[PDB]
Structures are given as C-alpha cells and as structure tokens.
Design an enzyme around this catalytic site. Structure first.
Site, mmCIF file in Angstrom:
data_model
loop_
_atom_site.group_PDB
_atom_site.id
_atom_site.type_symbol
_atom_site.label_atom_id
_atom_site.label_comp_id
_atom_site.label_asym_id
_atom_site.label_seq_id
_atom_site.Cartn_x
_atom_site.Cartn_y
_atom_site.Cartn_z
ATOM 1 N N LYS A 76 1.487 12.968 3.037
ATOM 2 C CA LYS A 76 2.481 11.777 2.434
ATOM 3 C C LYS A 76 3.355 12.576 0.939
ATOM 4 O O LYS A 76 2.947 13.509 0.357
ATOM 5 C CB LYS A 76 1.631 10.697 1.851
ATOM 6 C CG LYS A 76 1.049 10.085 2.926
ATOM 7 C CD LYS A 76 0.846 8.725 3.060
ATOM 8 C CE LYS A 76 0.288 8.045 4.338
ATOM 9 N NZ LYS A 76 0.208 6.749 3.753
ATOM 10 N N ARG A 89 -7.380 9.072 8.066
ATOM 11 C CA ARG A 89 -6.209 9.163 8.923
ATOM 12 C C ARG A 89 -5.680 10.338 8.788
ATOM 13 O O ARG A 89 -4.723 10.502 7.752
ATOM 14 C CB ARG A 89 -5.717 7.965 8.918
ATOM 15 C CG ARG A 89 -4.466 7.909 9.732
ATOM 16 C CD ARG A 89 -3.675 6.440 9.583
ATOM 17 N NE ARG A 89 -2.422 6.518 10.762
ATOM 18 C CZ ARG A 89 -1.207 7.051 10.402
ATOM 19 N NH1 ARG A 89 -0.992 7.862 9.328
ATOM 20 N NH2 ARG A 89 -0.251 6.988 11.266
HETATM 21 N N1 LIG Z 1 -3.953 2.468 8.231
HETATM 22 C C1 LIG Z 1 -3.043 3.108 8.129
HETATM 23 N N2 LIG Z 1 -1.875 3.310 8.790
HETATM 24 C C2 LIG Z 1 -0.734 3.925 8.357
HETATM 25 N N3 LIG Z 1 0.439 4.073 9.153
HETATM 26 C C3 LIG Z 1 1.474 4.851 8.752
HETATM 27 C C4 LIG Z 1 1.447 5.548 7.606
HETATM 28 C C5 LIG Z 1 2.446 6.095 7.385
HETATM 29 O O1 LIG Z 1 3.121 7.216 8.250
HETATM 30 P P1 LIG Z 1 2.842 8.676 8.935
HETATM 31 O O2 LIG Z 1 1.319 8.743 8.581
HETATM 32 O O3 LIG Z 1 3.415 8.820 10.162
HETATM 33 O O4 LIG Z 1 3.533 9.367 7.607
HETATM 34 N N4 LIG Z 1 0.425 5.402 6.799
HETATM 35 C C6 LIG Z 1 -0.674 4.567 7.276
HETATM 36 C C7 LIG Z 1 -1.885 4.655 6.325
HETATM 37 O O5 LIG Z 1 -2.045 5.234 5.134
HETATM 38 N N5 LIG Z 1 -3.164 3.700 6.943
#
Ligand SMILES: Nc1nc2ncc(COP(=O)(O)O)nc2c(=O)[nH]1
Ligand SMILES: Nc1nc2ncc(COP(=O)(O)O)nc2c(=O)[nH]1
Lengths: 266, 266
Positions: free
Chosen positions: B212, B246
């Site tokens: 990020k 994640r």
């Molecule tokens: N549960 C969860 N879901 C998410 N989905 C997308 C993104 C941002 O998009 P990317 O990972 O594709 O940059 N961050 C999250 C997160 O931090 N937690």
C-alpha cells in the site's frame, strides 16, 4: 529517550532516530597469502562500499570464524583499507585483547566481543584505554539454564562488572543477547520472545541473528535461503527495543528497519 | 486460545496454530471479453495454483479496483475455476450484496467487505443466510477523527451490530483495521502502532497492508519495490495478535509469518 550519543572518534551515532544497521563484512582470505593482498583487501573494500550504499551505519570486520598473530596480519589491512575508503565507523569482531588493540590502532572504532570480556578480560582494559564502545555478547560454555532469561541477564551482568572494573564508562557499553551462541534452537526462540527484558539493564542492545541455524531450524532452509526468517527476527527485535541489528543483507534489512521505525515511532 | 475454528464448508481453518495467509488473486480481465474467457480465467487459476504452492491458506478474489452485473459475469467464472481446481477456501472481495450471493453460489467461502456492511447492509443478510465467515473492514467517507483508534473501534463496532442484527454468529465475524482506507499516511502508521487494541473486541483480526501507499510514503518506493516494507507491517501485525494477513507476495510473507509464529509461540 537515550540521553547520549554513541561516540566513535570522527563519527557519532544517534541512538534515538533509527535502528542502526551493522553490516557484516565478509572477509574471504587468500589461500595463497597471510597478509593484505590485493584480492582479499579489494573484495573487502568493495563489499563495505556496497553496504554503505545500501544503508549500513557500521561496518563489522571479523578475523576468524587460527593463531593470534595471523588474525592481526589478516584483519589489520582490512581495517586500514575500509576506514580509509569508507566513511562509517568500523567495529572489530574479536574477543582477543591484542587483536582488539591492533584493530583500533589500525582504525577500528568499536570493539565487538562474542565473549563479553570473559574469554580475555584484558580486552575491557583496551576498550577503557582507547575510550571506545565495546559490545558485550551473551555467551558461555554450556546450555544448562535454570531460567534462560534470568541467567542471560545474570551472565551479561558479569560482563558489565568486568567492563566497569576495567574503566569502561556506561556510555561505552552495548549488550547483545548472543542469539545463536550457547543456546538450543528452542532457547534462541525464547530469547527472541523475551528480548525486551534485556532493557531493564539500561544499556543499548544489538541483535545478531542474520542467517543463523535457528532460522534454518524453523523454516527448514539453507543459509542462503534465510532472508525472510532473518527479517522476522529483525522486526521482532526492533519492536522489542533493540538499537542495532547485525546483518548480512544490508539492503533488505535496512528497509525493514526503516519501516519498523516508522511504525513504532522511533 | 481461540475456542473455535473457522468453518468454511469443506475446509476448516484453525486460528491457533499459525497466522493464516490470504493470497491476493490478481484478476487481469480481457479488454476483449465480459465473461470467463480462457486467458483471464487461466491466468487466474495458474496464480491461485502458485499461491497454494507457496503457503497460502485462503485465496482472495476481487471484481473491481464498474456495474453490478458486470462484476458477477467477471468474478463468477473465476470462482468456479479456482474452487474446482484449487482446494483452498475462497473469499469474495466485494461489498455488494448481489455479488457476494452469486460468488458464494459460485463457490466462494468467505465474504470480504471493505465497507463492513455499511455500503450494502443486505450483505450481512447474505452472510447470515449461507452461514459463512464475513470480514468487516474499517472504512468511512472522511479522515476526521477525534481519536483514531477509539473511532476505528467505534466504527468497527457499528459493523458488528449490523452483522449481528442480520443473523451473523460471533464465530463468523472477522475484523480488519482497513489500513490504507480513509486514513492519512501518518494515521495508517498509528493504526499499525496500535493494532493490538482491536483485540479487545474479541474477534479475529485480518491485516491487509500489502504494497500500500503508506509503505511507499515511508520508504519512498514504487509499489513493486515494497516487499520489505510489507514485511515489516506483517511482522508487527502478527506480534500485535492478528490471525490473518492479506498479501501479494505469498512465498516471502509465508516465511516471515512462519518465523514470527515460532518466535511469539503461536
Ligand atoms: N479485507 C481487506 N480487503 C481489502 N481489499 C482491497 C484492498 C486494497 O486493494 P489492493 O490490496 O488490491 O491494493 N485492501 C483490503 C484490505 O486491507 N483488507
Ligand atoms: N555482536 C555479535 N557478534 C557476532 N559475531 C559473530 C556471530 C556469528 O557469526 P556469523 O554472523 O558470521 O554467522 N554472531 C554475532 C552476534 O550475534 N553478535
């Protein structure tokens, strides 16, 4: 938060602004010489150069992994060359008194003693004389603890009383849990997990876990496949308050340190 | 230490033995199709295959980064293919009720809602109906906090009351600090630094920091140069008690997680 800086001759290391990175100088000798031949000294200078460009604050130079006089004839040209060509404080990784002394004479700035003054107590004396920081690592000839952390703290304390009785000022003392010495794989894990306890002693702490067995033991991976394991130990280390890490992978480890620093607010 | 397992249809995820790795499925669509064409679906299956081989416990599949019906026609073939060919629970990264429902129908096992039931409350309802874990991320349309962490906890609490009022069992609730949403760079750092507070809420926590902005902001590095930053956030996360991460880099991140686990005694 630390009321003083680390005094190191021409260089001063702040203990508050970042985790300081000690780069492990890889010192591959000539199977054909005993001195300061072009290849070993040149590889050494190149490698300190690269670690400086990658984020290293200190360069750590070791002689043996082996007589006394050999260690000097080997280690001394390395210090003269690196110090002359790389503007970072150099620490000399020896426990031998005569070796430390030559190294400083040659231009080393910090002593780094994996026997925290116990193998060769005169070494504190040298440290005292030249007024340099000395690192006292936890070590011992056995793995028999009643309580790992309490004993570790006890043993370290013994090193301080040696350093102090020799003239060493508090501000020149650095401690190190000696992960990977005199500990079983599971004991190393437990030192890691209790590293913060070392802080009650009131000295800055250096952590040296780079690529060691116990990472291999956990992850099941050769020494050259141990970057992510090392990484975790570095992170956990910094969160637990340590002020220095001793690391092979200066580039990667510098970045992890920098990010941890921003998280923990250092 | 957690008195239950994560129930996910044919698969069960223990919350005590390791930090569970959620692999971010990279879902590069066909500029030439709207459905489940061979290239996108095949790249997707290959990538879930590789993340499974690298240590991933869950595969996370997202539709948009954009009408409703498109999202399904795009995301549904991905789920049918991955679920049929990779034996790991799949989570569907959507906030839309109709999307979640199709995805589950298609074979998704967990809901993953970056608006923790606030953008589309019916989504809790779906979750309730199919009896699946739902992840409630912290999010909001503004960056105005009186006290980041207390507000974060407040906001999250609002998601739980929505999930609960809809039929969702405590054991199906997972929370996430939503690092990188609705927070300034410095606020993200501060959430990181206070992540452990989320535990008072009594639910398992997922952390999503992979690559990020805020890592970029600290380290000054492009998204593809953010592996060590990510690493630090993963480590700090695990030390602070989170049960899931994640992550894009499943291989590296799995190793760091495994080493942290051995250190912290998980
Ligand atoms: N549960 C969860 N879901 C998410 N989905 C997308 C993104 C941002 O998009 P990317 O990972 O594709 O940059 N961050 C999250 C997160 O931090 N937690
Ligand atoms: N201060 C300090 N010095 C050390 N010297 C050598 C080694 C082990 O050798 P290697 O780093 O070359 O494997 N470890 C340490 C350590 O952990 N701390």
């Amino acid at each position: 938060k630390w009321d003083y800086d680390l005094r190191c001759g021409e260089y001063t290391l702040n203990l508050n602004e970042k985790t300081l990175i000690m780069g492990i100088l890889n010192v591959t000798p000539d199977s054909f010489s005993d001195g300061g031949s072009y290849n070993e000294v040149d590889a050494a200078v190149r490698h300190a150069k690269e670690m400086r460009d990658e984020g290293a604050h200190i360069i750590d130079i070791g002689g043996e992994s082996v007589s006394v006089e050999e260690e000097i004839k080997r280690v001394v040209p390395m210090i003269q060359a690196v110090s002359k060509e790389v503007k970072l404080p150099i620490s000399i990784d020896t426990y031998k008194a005569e070796v430390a002394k030559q190294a400083i004479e040659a231009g080393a700035h910090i002593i780094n003693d994996i026997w925290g003054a116990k193998a060769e107590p005169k070494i504190a004396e040298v440290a005292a004389h030249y007024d340099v920081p000395i690192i006292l690592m936890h070590n011992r000839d056995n793995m028999n603890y009643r309580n790992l952390m309490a004993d570790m703290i006890a043993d370290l304390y013994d090193s301080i009383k040696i350093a102090k009785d020799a003239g060493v000022r508090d501000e020149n003392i650095i401690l190190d849990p000696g992960i990977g010495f005199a500990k079983t794989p599971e004991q190393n894990l437990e030192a890691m997990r209790n590293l913060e306890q070392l802080n009650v002693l009131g000295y800055p702490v250096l952590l040296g876990t780079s690529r060691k067995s116990f990472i291999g033991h956990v992850l099941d991976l050769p020494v050259e496949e141990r970057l992510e394991g090392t990484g975790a130990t570095v992170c956990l280390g910094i969160e637990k308050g340590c002020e220095f890490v001793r690391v092979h992978d200066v580039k990667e480890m510098s970045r992890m340190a920098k990010m941890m620093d921003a998280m923990i607010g250092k």
